[PDB]
Swiss-Prot record, chain A:
Miscellaneous information on this protein: Present with 1760 molecules/cell in log phase SD medium.
Pathway assigned to this chain's UniProt record: Lipid metabolism; fatty acid biosynthesis
Class of this enzyme: oxidoreductase
Protein name: 3-oxoacyl-[acyl-carrier-protein] reductase
InterPro entries: NAD(P)-bd_dom_sf (IPR036291), Sc_DH/Rdtase_CS (IPR020904), SDR_fam (IPR002347)
Gene Ontology molecular function, alphabetical: 3-oxoacyl-[acyl-carrier-protein] reductase (NADPH) activity; oxidoreductase activity, acting on the CH-OH group of donors, NAD or NADP as acceptor; quinone binding
Catalytic residues of the enzyme: 181, 197, 201
Free-text function comment from the UniProt entry: Involved in biosynthesis of fatty acids in mitochondria.
Gene that produces this protein: OAR1
Keywords: Fatty acid biosynthesis, Fatty acid metabolism, Lipid biosynthesis, Lipid metabolism, Mitochondrion, NADP, Oxidoreductase
EC number: 1.1.1.100
Stored CDD domains: SDR_c (cd05233)
Keyword Iron: no
Lineage per the UniProt record: Eukaryota, Fungi, Dikarya, Ascomycota, Saccharomycotina
Amino acid sequence: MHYLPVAIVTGATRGIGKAICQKLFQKGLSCIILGSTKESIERTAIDRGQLQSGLSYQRQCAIAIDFKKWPHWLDYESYDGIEYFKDRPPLKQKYSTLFDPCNKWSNNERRYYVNLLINCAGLTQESLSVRTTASQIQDIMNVNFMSPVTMTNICIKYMMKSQRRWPELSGQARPTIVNISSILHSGKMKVPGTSVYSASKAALSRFTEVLAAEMEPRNIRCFTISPGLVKGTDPVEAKEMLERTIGASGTSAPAEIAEEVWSLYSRT
Amino acid sequence: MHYLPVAIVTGATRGIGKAICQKLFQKGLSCIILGSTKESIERTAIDRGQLQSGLSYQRQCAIAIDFKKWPHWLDYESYDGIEYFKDRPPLKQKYSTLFDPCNKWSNNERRYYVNLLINCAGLTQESLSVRTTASQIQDIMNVNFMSPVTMTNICIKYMMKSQRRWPELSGQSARPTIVNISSILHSGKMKVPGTSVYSASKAALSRFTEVLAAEMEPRNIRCFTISPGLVKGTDSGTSAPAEIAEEVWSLYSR
């Protein structure tokens, strides 16, 4: 009216969110990046080069929010973010909500709205279960499952309201949510030291699937993507043999996942 | 001299933990029941009738633990429980750990020890995902997954130390065993609206156990997951409490 779609990218950790953002930006979307720290945010946010070459109305911001502290983060008064510009260096700003940047970007001729949520759920574990503290279990489950569930719920309600509030929006891709899992979440890929991380991804997966059935009668699309291991970090010999069990499912890279996310969002 | 295995039964609801305690007791084990509330315990605990027909050395006790309050219950200085007797009403007891009942029962010639742990992972969910609160999510996750994982790790630590402390235990009939109970809702076609988080917690428990089994190969400890059909409770895809008990027993004894 015009109407401008935006994606929220969540919990991205190993260049995966960078790759996702870059895809969405090349495809003409705006992004809200939700990082745990100012450092993670910076890594995810796209460069000034891809900023300058963006369509005139394209926007990117980032917001530091500690998912480790779920559910306390739900109750914060305002959120401290960072607004990006084509021509000048980034500027601090503050937000009433996670959807607020959409309000702030919008004017009389153009309405930015959230149409895509990607939950990356990227906190990794590298310790045997018997040697993992309560605090660590909490961090993995809060960052990978609990916080994603809340973003998912919050975002679905926003999406459901907006269809009512801006009827012309039915013209528009259907409202989408994608949650990223791991090949580790099921099957033969069982990696010692990966106990609660695998559990969290199985939880994210299963959750997304029952939710999809709840959202059938609604306009909302709920996808879960289950990539292979991405290069670096995360070695046992049996595993290397195990990994063979198949390609291309055993291994992944940021740019592949980015493409796989776009494939899902683009479907018609 | 005489080693007497004890079972810990956790998070039991809807008579599953009742069924489990029946089987275990009939077969000569002692139980430590960890329940959320005194009323939850009474349902799980075996009836005074079944107890008198038990052998002389058999014991039962119950401890109240609010698993919704994970990870706080981990820090208590002591735990308040209840000793069951064959010939009298129950006495209120204090325990310094969840395994302390074994020490208390033990005597020069008989050693009670925990050899089997069953996490029931009970709490259920009835609300749609978008109408369930954070507080409800925390409770489901804490009761069905967070606490079971903590119960599991604590127990494996105890199991490892005691195989060293009492070397004659390698020669026991059954190897230390952990069984976590999941649900058919945890995977596949059975996708029941109003169950997104509950299903999720079960998948988390299944997957955690599977990967744990991998870490427990080099060690004595058996780690099983069981995936029952829905219980008689709501409306090979259905399951009755009594039948889960047999599955748990066959898993432990073979």
